[PDB]
Design an enzyme around this catalytic site. Structure first.
Site, short mmCIF file in Angstrom:
data_model
loop_
_atom_site.label_atom_id
_atom_site.label_comp_id
_atom_site.label_asym_id
_atom_site.label_seq_id
_atom_site.Cartn_x
_atom_site.Cartn_y
_atom_site.Cartn_z
N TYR A 21 -25.37 -1.67 13.27
CA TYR A 21 -26.06 -1.36 12.03
C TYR A 21 -27.57 -1.27 12.27
O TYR A 21 -28.09 -1.70 13.30
CB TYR A 21 -25.74 -2.42 10.97
N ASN A 22 -28.26 -0.69 11.29
CA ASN A 22 -29.71 -0.54 11.35
C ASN A 22 -30.45 -1.27 10.24
O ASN A 22 -31.63 -1.59 10.42
CB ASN A 22 -30.09 0.95 11.31
N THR A 23 -29.80 -1.54 9.12
CA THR A 23 -30.46 -2.24 8.02
C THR A 23 -30.83 -3.66 8.43
O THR A 23 -30.03 -4.38 9.04
CB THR A 23 -29.56 -2.26 6.79
OG1 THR A 23 -28.69 -3.40 6.86
CG2 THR A 23 -28.72 -0.99 6.71
N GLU A 25 -23.27 2.03 6.78
CA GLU A 25 -23.17 0.67 7.28
C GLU A 25 -22.02 -0.08 6.63
O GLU A 25 -21.35 -0.90 7.27
CB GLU A 25 -24.49 -0.07 7.05
N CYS A 57 0.87 -1.17 0.00
CA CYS A 57 0.00 0.00 0.00
C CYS A 57 0.91 1.23 0.00
O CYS A 57 1.79 1.35 0.85
CB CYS A 57 -0.96 -0.02 1.19
SG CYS A 57 -0.39 0.75 2.72
#
Ligand code: ZN
Lengths: 572, 307, 304
Positions: B208-210, B278, B49
């Site tokens: 998360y909410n989904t 998310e 990287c």
């Protein structure tokens, strides 16, 4: 009563749980790959039964806590890292003591306890903060009071009040519940910072709980009042696990560590900074400790991860109190002696005093003369100074040197081999002052007669001695005109300040007072407003200064920077 | 830098990460700043990287470093050369780590290390590895092509990468960062322990909410800990499948091992009409989960040698 | 006749060491309750405490000062198996710098090397390992490196460097054992630094000492050509280590053997110039000794 001595039993696998029976003869050492029950004899110890006889290479029966129950002689229960709890009945007729299994737990179970009188009660701690209680009725296996906290790590039931119990959590709050009213808690106080790994009630008193945590603390709480309070705090060198009170002695605690430390300590609680005993035989972290009988303190059983079961005894300890060094001494530059010793030879405290038991050194250093006069005058002055100070044997040496050097005749080198030994005589007693002084006074006459390394040794020792007394003037007067080249170069390294103008930014080169580019008089005083050609003083904050004497005088009566500036370049 | 804006999706994690970075790279400790930057460059050059290596070359040069050390690795002190194989093991195959490497590291001689410097070196190596993983898994342009509102070699054996499934496995409940691992670091590294712990709790705070929250993050945690091999004791891996999906598993099992190969199309179809926060949270939890297992392996290697 | 002026330390447990710094005006006291206190001298003429904090998590055994050239620096060893270095930052701000955590059992002694070869530090261990540290950058006190390590195959309980500042005495160290082994193995050993192999090597062993040793102290040189060592096993003893002309070979001799204490002697010290020697036994009294130009040592004071 009881009898026995220190013992060993080398096992097959690491172990992390032990329990003892009411008969004070059985040990139930368990763990991840072993579950045995042992019988201890006065000479050795022999396995009596292997509970993993119906062996099955499955996770169904691991162990992280074993609790023996003293109402009958067969009721046993184990906690598995599979989240299932397996109870055993040694009275079963086939070669399998398993009696009843439980799978009403989310993740894992950590500690299992019983209740001393009733035999149909069995608590359990979890990792989901879901403590549960069971019964002997197979259908009735639920009482799931929860505390909105983190993982539970130890539950214990009280000795006298046989309706309540304690519990400890991961965040560091200890709670108190009652079986009759499982809706709301009775108390909650923040014992530690970090998880509390263990607890133990006091056998003697009515309500005295000791918790140990990862913060290397052991605290004993008094829960008799409405609000708890901390009385004692024992400081250990590693994280504390499995704290247990000793029998018949109400002020001793047996605590093992959970990392780094392999030893086992018993503390006096009253004296918390030093233990009372040190059992050191295990060669890895110990995992379980239990006192054999609650009415005879001599013996402690303590298994470890090194696959070993031990039954060490109190008498054969490794006490650190009697193997300590009680005193301490030190001298000083002024002949002051500091002596400290505990008040059992002059027992938990010590007393010290400073005994106000080389003045001539300072005056001899100040009053001597080392250059700027002829040889005879220097010797005479030094002799007079030595005589006035009180040492005559020192005074006559100077006069003799003057007679020798400052007079056919006697051979010229007659006293060379002779003066050469007076230096060594004065040096080999610690009086380097004279040796260095006469070396400086004579110089080239006697320089090529003492080895260079010896000259460096004397110069350096004298310089260190002078510097110890803060006699910087004499210390530099020795360096400036010392015979050795390597010695007379010490204030010649990194002693040149690089200085530049604060207007044109360029370095003031050469040896002058005017910038090459700015064409201004950079080295201008703040008070004199004249040109500074000699000593200039500076301020690290104000970046101001000037003549040394004027700035000294100004700062004696004023408190602001003389250049206007405004910054007080001496904070009060 | 550009990475700060992307990382600052949530405030409960950026502060902890910045604290750990400041302690590791700028606050005074047992190792000089130039040495710290050099081992950071060495660690970051394992995934190739260039963002981190570029950002670290200037820092090494500005802190009194020796330009002569950047013409390769053979021109580095032999004390720092003894860390190459340990870095190689920690990068991609940490299961094969043991006492031989650490004893060779603390073997008496002239380039002999000390036990108060090795711990900081290991923490820095793991931090740089996981940071490189995040940078190449949330691609940053030297500002991310993923979402919207020269280099030399510096490597020993570049043809070594991540192997197959795992072999004696690891039962993580017998060695946890809680009971004992934190205790060992708190004694070797008094200040670098609570900062790690705060970072881990922060990584566990985000949910998360989904569409029950925690189960979703548990799947990620256990899946990565298994692909490295930390097998737990309270899990049924038949429940791992119907939590993620192949469109969200090739991504994860490509960034964790060889993040050097993750192109625009590699992300282009993550899942559904995601909120793009998310997904950042998922790419972030991998940082902690990947830097946790390697540290646990290293701490086990340390503790076997002092027992 | 000294005047014994007592000061109240207010330590919550025993006191294990006292040390004057470089100028005789500040002292540091280490106790067994994880605390280190600093006392400074007033123009009035009394000591008052100016700093106190919590150092370790065990029992601090020793505290030693460093040379003022490197700053106001302190070091301490403890039962928590570590060693620390502190500096005073200007009010009384004492800040921790490093934590030497290499040990495995315990640390019993800690001593700074004489300030003519760097800022070097030597720590003992109850397992029998003597380790020597160093700080190449004199001014960063956070960067310490391990240079050598010596295994003496016996319990270690004391340490003392060689203050001789001449370019004719390779630096050497002395370690004392405290093993109560039934066998009469020697319990004092000497190691010296060899210039060409860059390694510490055993120089000589004091075979005549077969009793437990509680303190070891060298005598300041200030121009002598030989060395003097003091050991407090059960009676005060003074040795001589005159070398041979060119490891190196020393001819050890016994110069004093003083059973005046009728007890176990714990600690010893040297005055400022290797002329007077102090002692401290279980009887609770300090005693001073001195030579008489015939090398006939004799008592020169008793202090209670
Ligand atoms: Zn100013």
């Amino acid at each position: 009563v009881l009898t026995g001595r220190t013992m060993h039993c080398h096992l097959d696998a690491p172990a992390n749980a032990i329990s003892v029976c009411r008969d004070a003869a059985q040990v139930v050492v368990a763990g991840r790959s072993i579950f045995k029950i042992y019988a201890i004899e006065e000479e050795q110890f022999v396995e009596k039964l292997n509970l993993r006889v119906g062996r099955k290479p499955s996770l169904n029966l691991s162990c992280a806590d074993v609790v023996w129950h003293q109402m009958d002689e067969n009721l046993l229960a184990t906690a598995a890292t599979n989240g299932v709890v397996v109870t055993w009945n040694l009275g079963r007729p086939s070669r399998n003591k398993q009696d009843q299994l439980f799978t009403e737990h989310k993740r894992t179970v950590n500690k299992v306890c019983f209740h001393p009188t009733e035999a149909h009660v069995l608590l359990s701690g979890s990792q989901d903060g879901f403590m549960k209680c069971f019964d002997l009725r197979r259908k009735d296996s639920v009482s799931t009071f929860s505390g909105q906290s983190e993982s539970v790590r130890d539950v214990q039931f009280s000795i006298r009040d046989y309706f309540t119990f304690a519990s400890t959590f991961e965040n560091g709050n200890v709670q108190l519940w009652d079986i009759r009213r499982p809706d709301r808690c009775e108390r909650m106080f923040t014992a530690h910072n970090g998880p509390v790994f263990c607890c133990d009630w006091h056998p003697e008193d009515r309500g005295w709980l000791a918790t140990g945590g990862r913060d290397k603390m052991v605290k004993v709480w008094d829960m008799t009042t409405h609000r708890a309070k901390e009385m004692h705090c024992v400081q250990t060198i590693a994280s504390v696990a499995r704290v247990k009170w000793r029998p018949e002695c109400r002020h001793h605690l047996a605590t093992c560590s959970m990392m780094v430390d392999h030893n086992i300590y018993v503390w006096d609680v009253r004296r918390p900074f030093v233990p009372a005993a040190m059992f050191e035989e295990h060669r890895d972290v110990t995992t379980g400790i239990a006192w054999r009988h609650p009415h005879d303190p001599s013996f402690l059983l303590s298994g470890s991860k090194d696959s070993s079961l031990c039954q060490h005894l109190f008498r054969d300890a490794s006490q650190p109190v009697e193997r300590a060094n009680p005193e301490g001494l030190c001298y000083g530059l002024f002949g002051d002696l500091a002596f400290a010793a505990k008040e059992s030879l002059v027992l938990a405290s010590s007393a010290l005093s400073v005994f106000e038991t080389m003045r001539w050194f300072v005056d001899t250093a100040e009053r001597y003369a080392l250059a700027g006069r002829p040889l005879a005058e220097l010797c005479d002055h030094n002799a007079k100074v030595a005589r006035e100070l009180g040492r005559n044997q020192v005074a006559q040496t100077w006069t003799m040197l003057r007679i020798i050097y400052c007079s056919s005749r006697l051979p010229p080198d007659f006293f060379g081999v002779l003066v050469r030994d007076m230096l060594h005589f004065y040096a080999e007693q610690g009086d380097v002052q004279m040796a260095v002084s006469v070396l400086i006074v004579l110089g080239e006459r006697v320089r090529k007669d003492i080895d260079e390394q010896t000259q460096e040794h004397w110069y350096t020792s004298y310089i260190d001695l002078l510097q110890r007394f803060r006699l910087w003037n004499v210390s530099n007067e020795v360096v400036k005109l010392s015979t050795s080249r390597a010695v007379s170069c010490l204030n010649q390294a990194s002693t040149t300040l690089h200085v530049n103008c604060s207007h044109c930014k360029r370095p003031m080169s050469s040896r002058g007072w005017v910038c090459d580019r700015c064409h201004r008089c950079a080295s201008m005083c703040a008070v004199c407003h004249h040109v500074v050609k000699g000593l200039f003083v500076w301020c690290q904050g104000c970046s101001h200064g000037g003549h040394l004497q004027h700035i000294m005088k100004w700062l004696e009566g004023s408190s602001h920077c003389p250049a206007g500036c405004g910054h007080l370049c001496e904070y009060s | 830098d550009n990475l700060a804006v992307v990382m600052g999706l949530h405030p409960d994690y950026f502060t902890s990460f910045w604290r750990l970075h400041y302690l590791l790279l700028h606050t005074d400790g047992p190792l000089a700043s130039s040495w710290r930057h050099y081992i950071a460059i060495m660690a970051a050059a394992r995934h190739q990287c260039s963002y981190l290596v570029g950002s670290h070359m200037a820092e090494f040069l500005q802190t009194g470093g020796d330009p002569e050390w950047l013409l390769g690795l053979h021109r580095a002190p032999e004390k720092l050369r003894k860390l190459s194989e340990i870095n190689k093991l920690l990068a991609h195959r940490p299961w094969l780590i043991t006492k031989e490497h650490i004893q060779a590291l603390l073997k008496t001689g002239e380039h002999t290390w000390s036990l108060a410097e090795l711990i900081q070196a290991l923490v820095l190596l793991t931090h740089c590895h996981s940071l490189s993983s995040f940078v190449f898994g949330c691609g940053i342009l030297p500002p991310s092509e993923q979402s919207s509102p020269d280099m030399l070699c510096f490597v020993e054996d570049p043809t070594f990468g991540y192997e197959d499934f795992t072999p004696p496995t690891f039962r993580a409940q017998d060695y946890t960062w809680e009971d004992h691992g934190y205790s060992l670091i708190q004694r070797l590294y008094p200040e670098g322990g609570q900062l790690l712990d705060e970072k881990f709790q922060a990584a566990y705070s985000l949910t998360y909410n989904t569409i029950d929250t925690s189960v979703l993050r548990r799947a990620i945690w256990n899946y990565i800990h298994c692909v490295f091999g930390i097998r737990y004791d309270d899990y049924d891996y038949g429940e791992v499948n119907q939590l993620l999906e192949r469109n969200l598993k090739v991504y994860i099992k490509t960034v964790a091992c060889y993040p050097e190969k993750t192109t625009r199309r590699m992300y282009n179809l993550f899942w559904r009409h995601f909120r793009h926060s998310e997904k950042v949270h998922v790419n972030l939890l991998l940082l902690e989960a990947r830097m946790q297992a390697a540290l646990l392996y290293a701490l086990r290697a340390i503790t076997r040698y002092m027992t | 006749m000294f005047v014994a002026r007592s000061i109240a330390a207010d330590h919550k447990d025993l006191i294990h060491d006292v040390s004057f710094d470089f100028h005789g005006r500040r002292m540091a006291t280490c106790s067994s309750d994880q605390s280190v206190k600093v006392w400074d001298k007033s123009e009035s003429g009394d000591w008052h405490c100016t700093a106190s904090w919590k150092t370790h998590s065990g029992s601090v055994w020793r505290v030693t000062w460093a040379h003022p050239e490197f700053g106001q620096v302190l070091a301490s060893c403890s039962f928590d198996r570590t060693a620390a270095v502190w500096e005073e930052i200007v009010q009384s701000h004492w800040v921790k710098r490093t934590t030497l955590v290499d040990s495995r059992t315990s640390v019993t002694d800690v001593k700074f090397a004489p300030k003519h070869m760097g800022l070097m530090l030597a720590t003992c261990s109850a397992d029998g390992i003597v380790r020597i540290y160093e700080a190449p950058d004199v001014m960063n006190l956070s960067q310490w490196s391990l240079q050598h390590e010596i295994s003496c195959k016996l319990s270690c309980s004391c340490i003392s460097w060689n203050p001789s500042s001449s370019r004719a005495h390779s630096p050497m160290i002395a370690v004392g054992s405290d093993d109560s082994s039934p066998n009469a193995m020697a319990k004092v050993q000497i190691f010296e630094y060899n210039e060409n192999t860059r390694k510490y090597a055993k120089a000589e062993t004091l075979m005549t000492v077969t009793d437990p040793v509680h303190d070891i102290a060298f005598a300041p040189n200030l121009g002598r050509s030989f060395h003097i060592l003091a050991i407090a096993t059960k009676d005060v003893r003074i040795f001589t280590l005159k070398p041979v002309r060119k490891p190196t070979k020393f001819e050890i001799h016994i110069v004093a053997q003083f059973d005046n204490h009728n007890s176990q002697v714990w600690r010893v010290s040297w005055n400022i110039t290797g002329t007077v020697l102090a002692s401290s036994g279980d009887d609770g009294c300090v005693r001073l000794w001195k030579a008489n130009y015939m090398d006939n040592w004799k008592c020169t004071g008793i202090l209670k």
